[PDB]
């Protein structure tokens, strides 16, 4: 599974506020108070924000205590973690990250999902977002142009599921999406 895909800022060795928080599902919810919208929205927002903070902590601590070119495909920081029930998830989940520059994209995946596939897919997606959208100066192209991100994930990441795409199948999806936008 993948509960959500993220793009969030990463501080340098200012709160970490998710620029793009796509939640790929819902959770069962019953309080005696009638089922509202404020409660559910605030829950499904604070969970993702907490995951973003945890990935920021992991990335920063990895940066100081790695020594690997302190401050590039396999040269970016990578790692994994595990969450805490009721702080704030129901079913506990693993968190996968791969930070580039200052845009740490994360994946909240269930314990019955492949880790190596998660890291490979997050790598390919962050390459695609760095190139197709090219926000390495006009960062406004990431918030006012959220439709590009929406298109990219809706093509490659259908409904919180990871695919074992290979050269021929990536060629097929490249034939699919390349011309859909100018």
């Amino acid at each position: 599974m993948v509960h959500a895909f993220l793009i969030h800022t990463l501080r340098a060795p200012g709160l970490c506020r998710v620029l793009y928080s796509c939640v790929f599902g819902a959770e069962k919810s019953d309080d005696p108070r009638p089922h509202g919208a404020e409660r559910d929205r605030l829950l499904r927002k604070e969970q993702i924000l907490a995951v973003a903070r945890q990935v920021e902590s992991m990335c920063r601590l990895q940066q100081q205590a790695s020594g690997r070119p302190p401050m590039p495909l396999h040269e970016a920081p990578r790692g994994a973690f595990r969450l805490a029930a009721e702080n704030p998830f129901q079913e506990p989940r693993t968190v996968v990250w791969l930070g580039v520059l200052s845009l740490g994209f994360a994946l909240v995946l269930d314990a019955h999902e492949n880790l190596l596939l998660a890291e490979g897919t997050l790598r390919l997606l962050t390459r695609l977002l760095l190139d197709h959208l090219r926000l390495l100066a006009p960062s406004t192209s990431l918030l006012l142009r959220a439709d590009r991100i929406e298109g990219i994930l809706t093509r490659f990441l259908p409904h919180g599921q990871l695919l074992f795409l290979n050269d021929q199948f990536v060629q097929g999806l490249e034939k699919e999406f390349s011309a859909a936008w100018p």
Binding site: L15, C16, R17, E27, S29, D31, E38, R39, D40, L42, L43, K45, E46, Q47, L49, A50, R53, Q54, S57, M58, L61, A84, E86, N87, P88, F89, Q90
Partner: protein
Amino acid sequence: MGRVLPMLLVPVPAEAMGQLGSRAQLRTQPEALGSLTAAGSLQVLSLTRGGGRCCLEGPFWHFLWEDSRPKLLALGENYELLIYEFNLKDGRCDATILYSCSREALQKLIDDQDISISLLSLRILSFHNNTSLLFINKCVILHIIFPERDAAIRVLNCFTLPLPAQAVDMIIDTQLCRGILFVLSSLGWIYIFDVVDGTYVAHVDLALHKISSFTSLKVSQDLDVAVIVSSSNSAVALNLNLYFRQHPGHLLCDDPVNSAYNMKLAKFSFQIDRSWKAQLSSLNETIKNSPWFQDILKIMHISEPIELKCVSVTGFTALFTWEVERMGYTITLWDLETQGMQCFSLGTKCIPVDSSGDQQLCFVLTENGLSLILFGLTQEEFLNRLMIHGSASTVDTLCHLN
């Protein structure tokens, strides 16, 4: 090893014990020891020397001394309530009658509250600060007040029991414990009402705790533990907080932005500040660490006591009284937390004296007189503690008196 520690801090000859009643009650201070004779005469043995007896004659079958945690108030056969004052100045067992109430006036006061019921029986519940609570007709909890300047007895509150007449007339005990007025119905329920407002603030399912005929129930002075003694010499004690929660069906009683949302997202609630330095404190705390009345603002069977009326119940202890003609008086002590019992057998000429106060140690009137029964205290240990507390004169007195 619970035989006795039977001390005696004042003597009383058996000449008066041949004249006193079968049950008695003592003030917190040594003010009197009044006992009820079967002939209706109220005998008061002043154990405040020589100790002569005073007699109060009438058709009295219920009374209670002024328990200010002696001013005796009693109701006759004609449902006429009287208040007589006894003064123990210099050993003079002299008494005077201060306040009297007639049955016609009581019915008039009951009717003036729009209660279309004739007073058939009045059972007392308390007498504090000249204010008396009475469960009139077993249904109307009329809180009388006999105020200063000979003001008439007017009910400052009169709330009918929020229950049907099917169980309203089957009430037994009316106990006031810091305002949580409990009325016990003999069928096995305790409708905890509040004398301040009258609401059915809660309800306790004594039946769900699983005999019958709950004769009396004792409330701890902190409203913490309640023990109900039926007419079958059986007492069961369960915790109010646990007995209201474990069966709650019967109980009718970036930094901030995500944190306050954790306060209002109540499906779950984060625990959020999700670093990798304050997530170790959580592990440390988990490893290290690994009531009911707030909203309403084993079993004792001695293998038959006549009147198994527990004297008082504290947070961690419970003391009871049992008297039998065949063998004498059996005094019981139960530890609420430790679940231990100490039962001692005494002589056949001895009756309890309910210390209507703070000292809940069984002060049994024995043949020689006053006798405070304790547990576990050796004579050497007790006298040593007195000496470590005061002079040797007290130790000499307590060693010589026996």
